[PDB]
Design a protein around this ligand. Structure first.
Ligand SMILES: O=C(O)C(=O)C[C@H](CCCc1ccccc1)C(=O)O
Ligand SMILES: O=C(O)C(=O)C[C@H](CCCc1ccccc1)C(=O)O
Ligand SMILES: [Zn+2]
Ligand SMILES: [Zn+2]
Lengths: 335, 335
């Protein structure tokens, strides 16, 4: 249920701002950084919302005005779409599927250009949607550097150390419009997802729900994203989506959501909730141990399947032949 | 059609001695060793019957009396079954499938014991069937050594050399009763199949008919054998068996059938044709070239599928989990 803002400022959000879906959910725990139960959830690669890390405390003051003045004059990737759904696609893989035409369009622009194009849309009451998704890098101005340096590296570096993770891979800055949706997908890195402005509903599914969520082929541009349209699920093609069960939370400013690697997550910016701002923190997972303990975890079986698809594509010389060979291998033999 | 024996001794066999099956066939070429077309078929890994190799010329005099006196006192593997079908099973794999109970029983016996047990059956008019299948080895007596040494090694060694094959792996001695059937299966080695006594109908299918012939799982004891019962094909489980097309021949004494590696073959001893005797010659195939030429041959795709099954069984720690993972990989994704 919705949390209540300090100073009797009312519920920060209400249930009318959440989209409606076909499956049930149960809440992700919201705990203090100091709560041993939080450390045990992270250790066991289960999601948890930490309410008091201060991980991005200097960025809580961020808004569009502030960022435009200080984020510098680098290029920012901005996606545009006529739908609320911003399905990720990997442009390096579009050669394998020359029949895939994305629904989002990516435009590289300056931050002020992003603010203006967003202003124009608001002014003319258009229905075009934008989502800025850009890795933070050296081109940011001095006050963003100062803010970045003031993140709680003491806390997150200890996490990284305790869990045996690899190095921080990148931080993604995410600025979306109310109602934007990033469809369900899993990532191969560990993620601390730090909410800065506005509210995002996060729906996670464990790796053992692979069978219910139907990822695209590995060589397709939408590798790791679900094929299922959550707004109109096709149960004839995706029957096990009728068994899917999620873990849900709404993060607001100050919250940090641990999204364990291989966990599926669907992310939406709350309807009529204004713009959202988030920064994520991606780490490579801990190395695979030399001695493999059986039984294997769910995410290890996902990794085996990915590797089988990649090797078959290499061996056959063409990723389009992956599906026919696999069918030939199973029909009348393993089904 | 049936060939005619020299000296106006009539057709050696007639069509009434062949079992009846559901698919069509066309003949395998019968050619002279000296015929360039024969060399081109072998070079292109296509079956051919060579009528004049003299490969096992000293063994053409072999019968049960002769062999019993001279084959020595080693152990011979003899299979018994209540059916005409002698489905091969690999005893080293029976641990993976503790629910598989063979229909053939293997008994290790002396050759005279084989002749006697065969006599008893004939005497009492029983319907029990035997099939002796034994690798030739050092225990054979001097006259079999002399016979073996007189095979046409000049011709077969040149074949082995020309084709880049590996070393002769083994020679299998095969002594079966009229009507015995070895069900359809493929082998991973190259085979020169030398007929000595009686007549065997050989039905081959190219490796690109994998999809029509439904081999057992790699880790099952009947790895490489078809699951399809040729006498009662289940078209609901094995629908593509309705598209299978074979290449057929009847080999008699003096004939040598080249069975290329990965080619499926079904072998039957002709009804009411007496005992049959055969010796095969298995060679490892030529090494896989360093530079892989695309497109891949059918047998190369079979080998990829085999390797995928073997690695998945190793990675998962249990061959029983191979089928569920493969289904999970394909359902709603590649089918
Ligand atoms: O931080 C995460 O991991 C998220 O999923 C946040 C998500 C945007 C992700 C865009 C994307 C999708 C697939 C691959 C790489 C990038 C959002 O907040 O809308
Ligand atoms: O020479 C061949 O290759 C044959 O198929 C001949 C065949 C008996 C083969 C028995 C067997 C089946 C599977 C694996 C190893 C051995 C016959 O003539 O009845
Ligand atoms: Zn993600
Ligand atoms: Zn064989």
């Amino acid at each position: 249920e919705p949390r209540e803002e300090a100073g009797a400022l009312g519920p920060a959000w209400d249930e009318s701002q959440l989209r409606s879906y076909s499956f049930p959910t149960r809440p992700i725990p919201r705990l203090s950084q100091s709560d041993p139960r939080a450390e045990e959830l992270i250790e066991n690669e289960e999601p948890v919302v930490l309410t008091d890390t201060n991980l991005v405390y200097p960025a809580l003051k961020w808004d569009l005005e502030y960022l435009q003045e200080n984020i510098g004059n680098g290029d920012f990737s901005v996606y545009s779409a006529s739908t609320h759904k911003f399905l990720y696609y990997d442009e390096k893989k579009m050669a394998n599927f020359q029949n895939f035409k994305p629904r989002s369009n990516r435009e590289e622009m300056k931050f002020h250009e992003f603010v203006e194009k967003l202003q124009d849309i608001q002014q003319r009451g258009g229905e075009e949607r934008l989502y800025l998704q850009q890795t933070l890098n050296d081109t940011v101005g001095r006050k963003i550097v100062m803010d970045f340096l003031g993140f709680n590296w003491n806390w997150i570096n200890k996490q990284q150390g305790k869990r045996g993770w690899g190095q921080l891979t990148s931080n993604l800055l995410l600025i979306g419009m109310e109602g934007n949706v990033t469809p369900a997908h899993y990532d191969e890195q560990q993620n601390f997802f730090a909410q800065i402005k506005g509210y995002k509903r996060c729906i996670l599914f464990p790796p053992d729900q692979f069978e219910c969520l139907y990822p695209y082929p590995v060589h397709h541009p939408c590798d790791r994203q679900s094929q299922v349209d959550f707004d109109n699920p096709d149960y004839e093609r995706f029957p096990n989506f009728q068994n899917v069960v999620g873990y849900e939370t709404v993060v607001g400013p100050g919250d940090v959501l641990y999204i364990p690697m291989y966990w599926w997550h669907h992310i939406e910016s709350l309807l009529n909730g204004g713009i959202t701002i988030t920064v994520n923190f991606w780490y490579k997972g801990a190395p695979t141990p030399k001695r493999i303990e059986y039984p294997l975890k769910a995410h290890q079986k996902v990794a085996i399947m990915r590797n089988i698809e990649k090797m078959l594509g290499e061996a056959l010389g063409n990723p389009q032949e992956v599906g026919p060979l696999l069918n030939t291998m199973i029909k009348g033999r393993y089904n």
